[PDB]
């Protein structure tokens, strides 16, 4: 019995038929007769196993149940994208000397996202910079790293005199960019 | 056995399925093969077999909208080009991923409604659409709601909307236009069922003589 795909938060109807068994019919193991208790059942006689109620990945992402040759039963519980990505701080903070030359690593933010990061994008999350402010000597003085989140400074007039402080709006996407997007700042310093 | 594929996978690819095994075990060597839409004809190459493993494998992201599901068949040939069975029936069947925010038919809607009606008449419906599955997955399924109310006159809250319709309506008694003649709702449609990704639009409502 090859695995079997079930994405989390279905509608259903519940219960809800999933493979038919190929002489009565029964269902073991943790998720049908150990807790969680009666998640998964069988129909006795048609051996259609069934899932009761709608699954959590979260939860719990994977069931190894056994039919009665004792045949396996391997459930794995497929992702939505039903968390939203949080910067782990309202405010990250930084620094560099004003000589630095372009490419030079200044922070790296960080957004929590829940969701699997692994087989799909609903963990992924994509930083972006929304907005830099003072624009001086110019705007988008700045770019951060797609996945890693490290801010980088690219520009050549830093001049603590002048500026000695950027303050960057910033955001982070999961769905790789595609879905939702959270804001955070960060505050650059130049450092005398 | 259908295969259940979410669209939009990270792999890497190529990425394995299924192993398929035919029915001649000990007896000799086997080469499978695979065809159908997906495989040998248009799309081709989305998804391929390993000749002697037997392994299924999908070879790209897959995109349910694009293609909700295959029909593939699979095939046992000895290295005789002998054949024992029947071609196998490979169902790849793609659920869906939350990939499209729910979207407004208007930006801005307009209704109206008699000044001296029973509270819970309807008033008018709005409607945003969004493109994933709504039969299997709440992706697809939209929930509406009110963020907010001007003016506050007689007071605040006196429209609701119904999370599934849209159809908005009247919840109090004491409209007038000769008090206020007009409301304007800022109104919110959130997929997966209140869940997911919001949008926003507007709800303009008229008194009547
Ligand atoms: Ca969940
Ligand atoms: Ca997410
Ligand atoms: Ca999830
Ligand atoms: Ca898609
Ligand atoms: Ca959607
Ligand atoms: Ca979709």
Known sequence: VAPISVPENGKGPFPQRL??????????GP??????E????????????????????EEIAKYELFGHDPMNISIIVTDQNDHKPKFTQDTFRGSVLEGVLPGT????????????????????????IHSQE????????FTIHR????????????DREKVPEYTLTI???????????????????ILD
Do not use: C
């Open 171 to 189: 955001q982070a996407t999961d769905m790789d960019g595609d879905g939702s997007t959270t804001t955070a700042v960060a505050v650059v310093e």
């Open 31 to 36: 998720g049908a007769d150990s807790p969680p």
């Open 38 to 57: 009666g998640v998964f059942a069988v129909e006795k006689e048609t051996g259609w196993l069934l899932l009761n109620k709608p699954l959590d990945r």
């Open 147 to 158: 996945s890693t989140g490290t801010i980088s400074v690219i520009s050549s007039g830093l």
């Open 105 to 128: 690593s200044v922070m790296q933010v960080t957004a929590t996202d829940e969701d699997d990061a692994i087989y799909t994008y609903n963990g992924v999350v994509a930083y972006s």
């Open 134 to 141: 003072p624009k001086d000597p110019h705007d988008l003085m």
């Open 19 to 28: 493979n038919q068994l190929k002489i009565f019919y029964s269902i073991t």
